Amino acid sequence: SGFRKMAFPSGKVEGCMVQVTCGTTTLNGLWLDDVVYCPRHVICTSEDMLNPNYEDLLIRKSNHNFLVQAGNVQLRVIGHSMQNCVLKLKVDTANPKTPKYKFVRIQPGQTFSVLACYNGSPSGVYQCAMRPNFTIKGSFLNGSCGSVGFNIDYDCVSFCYMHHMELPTGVHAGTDLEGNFYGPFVDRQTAQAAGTDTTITVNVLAWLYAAVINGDRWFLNRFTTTLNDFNLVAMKYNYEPLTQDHVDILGPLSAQTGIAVLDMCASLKELLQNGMNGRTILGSALLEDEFTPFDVVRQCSGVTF
Amino acid sequence: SGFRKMAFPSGKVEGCMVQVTCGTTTLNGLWLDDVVYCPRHVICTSEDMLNPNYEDLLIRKSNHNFLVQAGNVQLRVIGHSMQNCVLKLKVDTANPKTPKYKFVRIQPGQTFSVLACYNGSPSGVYQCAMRPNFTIKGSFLNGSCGSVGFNIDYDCVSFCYMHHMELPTGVHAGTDLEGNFYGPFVDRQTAQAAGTDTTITVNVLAWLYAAVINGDRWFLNRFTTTLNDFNLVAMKYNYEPLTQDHVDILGPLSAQTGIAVLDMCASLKELLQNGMNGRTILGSALLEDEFTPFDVVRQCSGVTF
Ligand SMILES: CC(C)NC(=O)CN1C[C@@H](C(=O)Nc2cncc3cc(F)ccc23)c2cc(Cl)ccc2C1=O
Ligand SMILES: CC(C)NC(=O)CN1C[C@@H](C(=O)Nc2cncc3cc(F)ccc23)c2cc(Cl)ccc2C1=O
Numbered sequence: 001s002g003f004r005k006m007a008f009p010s011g012k013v014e015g016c017m018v019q020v021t022c023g024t025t026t027l028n029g030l031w032l033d034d035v036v037y038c039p040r041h042v043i044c045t046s047e048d049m050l051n052p053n054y055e056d057l058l059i060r061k062s063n064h065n066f067l068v069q070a071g072n073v074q075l076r077v078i079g080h081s082m083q084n085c086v087l088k089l090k091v092d093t094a095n096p097k098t099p100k101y102k103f104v105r106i107q108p109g110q111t112f113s114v115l116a117c118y119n120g121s122p123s124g125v126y127q128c129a130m131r132p133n134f135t136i137k138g139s140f141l142n143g144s145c146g147s148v149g150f151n152i153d154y155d156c157v158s159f160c161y162m163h164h165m166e167l168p169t170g171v172h173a174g175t176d177l178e179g180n181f182y183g184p185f186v187d188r189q190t191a192q193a194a195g196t197d198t199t200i201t202v203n204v205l206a207w208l209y210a211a212v213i214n215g216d217r218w219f220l221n222r223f224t225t226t227l228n229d230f231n232l233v234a235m236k237y238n239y240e241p242l243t244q245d246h247v248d249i250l251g252p253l254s255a256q257t258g259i260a261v262l263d264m265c266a267s268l269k270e271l272l273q274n275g276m277n278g279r280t281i282l283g284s285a286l287l288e289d290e291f292t293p294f295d296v297v298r299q300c301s302g303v304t305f
Numbered sequence: 306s307g308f309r310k311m312a313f314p315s316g317k318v319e320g321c322m323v324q325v326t327c328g329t330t331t332l333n334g335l336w337l338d339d340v341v342y343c344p345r346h347v348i349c350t351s352e353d354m355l356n357p358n359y360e361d362l363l364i365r366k367s368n369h370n371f372l373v374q375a376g377n378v379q380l381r382v383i384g385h386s387m388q389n390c391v392l393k394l395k396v397d398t399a400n401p402k403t404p405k406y407k408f409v410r411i412q413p414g415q416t417f418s419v420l421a422c423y424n425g426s427p428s429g430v431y432q433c434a435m436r437p438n439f440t441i442k443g444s445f446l447n448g449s450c451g452s453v454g455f456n457i458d459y460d461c462v463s464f465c466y467m468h469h470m471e472l473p474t475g476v477h478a479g480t481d482l483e484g485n486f487y488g489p490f491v492d493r494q495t496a497q498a499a500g501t502d503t504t505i506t507v508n509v510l511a512w513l514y515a516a517v518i519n520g521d522r523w524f525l526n527r528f529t530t531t532l533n534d535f536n537l538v539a540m541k542y543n544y545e546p547l548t549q550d551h552v553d554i555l556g557p558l559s560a561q562t563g564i565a566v567l568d569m570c571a572s573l574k575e576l577l578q579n580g581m582n583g584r585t586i587l588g589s590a591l592l593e594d595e596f597t598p599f600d601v602v603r604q605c606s607g608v609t610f
């Protein structure tokens with residue numbers, strides 16, 4: 001019993017965190033095999049950040065201009081290349097702590113664990129989700145650039161996010177491990193704003209199934225809805241549209257609890273209309289959208305209470 | 306910017322988790338130096354749990370009855386002894402991954418990170434607090450017994466909790482690493498219940514200071530209160546009493562934001578008497594009490610491990 005916002009154990013990623021320094025800039029790098037991955041903006045001055053020409057800034061650098069520190073050991077850079085918004089520093093030592101890993105690009109609604117780091121040293125781990133507007137609501141201070149997001153399903157670490165910047169609303173933007181940004185963002189100090197954010201409907205439904213599994217049913221009702229009528233009401237509350245893919249994905253949780261997806265959609269419609277009336281669901285007075293259907297199945301029991 | 310429920314990096318603890326099997330029962334153990342620590346109920350059948358005599362159950366066991374597995378390696382048990390509700394299994398190999406550590410007993414209100422494990426394998430990490438009624442609101446399934454709670458202070462891991470059981474309300478009970486229970490609980494299959502819980506007042510105040518640091522100021526007011534009048538109000542809402550020690554502890558956050566502790570108490574009093582009026586604080590519609598004053602300072606300053 002219980003339902004917590006749970007992150008993956010961070011040990012496999014801690015053994016990959018290094019410090020990367022160019023000149024006056026210091027940030028985090030991810031050391032896997034004989035390559036260190038870090039945001040390309042490590043080569044920028046504060047005077048370069050408005051309209052940097054990364055190809056022109058990079059051509060002026062040599063291997064010895066990059067200082068990579070792993071714990072108290074200085075690593076030797078023997079090569080460098082840029083791939084999209086990521087800098088790849090070839091080093092003379094393969095990381096002995098390299099876990100089994102993959103690089104995966106995630107979609108909005110997907111969750112992952114973030115290992116926040118400063119100076120190549122881990123400070124904390126938290127769980128979060130890729131918002132529909134492609135930003136993440138992280139907790140990051142100056143020097144956190146290069147911190148990574150990951151999932152550890154079974155024994156393999158799937159790296160999905162690398163932190164690059166904070167937007168004016170306090171939310172965060174970054175890339176996959178191939179340097180492609182999530183969203184319409186660019187690694188420039190030019191005025192950029194996150195689009196209007198929405199609630200991840202499939203995740204709220206999954207979390208309502210998690211509450212039923214843990215023994216709570218106060219919010220259920222005797223009604224059902226069509227998928228189209230649910231979407232007409234959902235979008236008036238800034239909820240993402242629920243697709244047939246989402247309905248299919250909720251199938252196993254529906255079979256486990258005995259509550260059809262469109263019946264759970266009717267309960268959510270009623271919750272949006274009435275509020276909670278002083279009640280809570282899994283210890284929360286808000287509808288939670290940062291647990292996917294896969295997270296609920298992983299954390300919850302296979303036996304409904 | 307941002308404020309997340311953040312756990313300590315779990316790597317130093319992952320390298321200590323092992324699987325302990327005694328007969329048909331399998332649970333988790335903590336391997337530090339040449340000793341494996343685990344709940345003493347690992348020696349019980351479901352019948353023994355009704356009314357166990359642990360010394361009598363233990364005398365019938367030999368070293369070879371305990372199977373300890375560290376990854377894919379079987380460890381050799383060369384001795385066994387009991388300390389309170391913890392079983393200590395002496396093994397022939399010191400853990401090469403043993404970090405610098407201490408065993409510390411925490412007080413209600415203090416927070417810690419839990420590394421949830423199954424079969425000696427870590428599955429997740431979450432942050433939680435020792436409730437005033439000595440229970441923890443964890444997320445645990447069958448097989449989780451022996452999972453540990455910890456904090457990291459500089460480079461030293463302070464182990465403060467070991468999981469033993471779940472109460473009928475779905476909350477959890479456990480011991481310090483010397484086998485002493487937190488709370489009036491016993492390790493047996495018998496009717497046990499958590500006492501009426503209260504909110505950790507010093508932690509809610511710390512979280513309000515964290516909200517101010519992150520730009521959330523709507524709840525501030527021009528008023529102040531005496532410590533005695535605040536405690537009369539707080540006692541009415543099932544809030545723990547606020548002591549002068551708590552006021553002193555909040556001193557640094559008070560100086561940083563410019564809001565005296567009793568000035569913030571007058572905000573908390575107004576929130577208790579009137580609610581949030583449709584508003585949220587740091588994305589929550591409830592007053593959050595699982596961040597201590599130290600957690601707020603650490604996350605708002607980027608301390609690393
Ligand atoms: C408040 C933000 C805008 N920081 C700055 O004043 C300057 N800034 C530096 C950097 C960046 O955003 N770093 C940070 C990343 N995460 C959390 C931060 C929190 C903080 F308080 C400061 C910095 C943070 C950056 C990188 C890129 Cl690719 C594009 C632009 C910038 C940039 O403008
Ligand atoms: C919760 C009860 C009714 N479970 C059981 O059927 C039997 N149970 C086993 C064990 C215990 O509590 N194990 C668990 C520990 N954490 C999360 C659990 C979640 C679950 F679903 C089942 C078990 C869990 C235990 C230990 C001690 Cl010291 C005293 C009593 C017991 C005990 O009663």
Ligand SMILES: [Cl-]
Binds near residue numbers: 105106107110
């Ligand atoms: Cl995805």
